[PDB]
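Materials and Methods. Structural model of VP2. The 32-residue sequence of VP2 from Banna virus was retrieved and submitted for structure prediction as follows.
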Amino acid sequence: VQTQDFKTAVQPDTNTAQLIKTYSNPKQRGDK
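The predicted structure was written out as tokens:
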């Protein structure tokens, strides 16, 4: 639900990844 501060090679904040995160891992802070 929370977008990351910046995009990396390992973790590109894509729409599908955020969609999966709505049930796999909500409450994940986007601060790096």
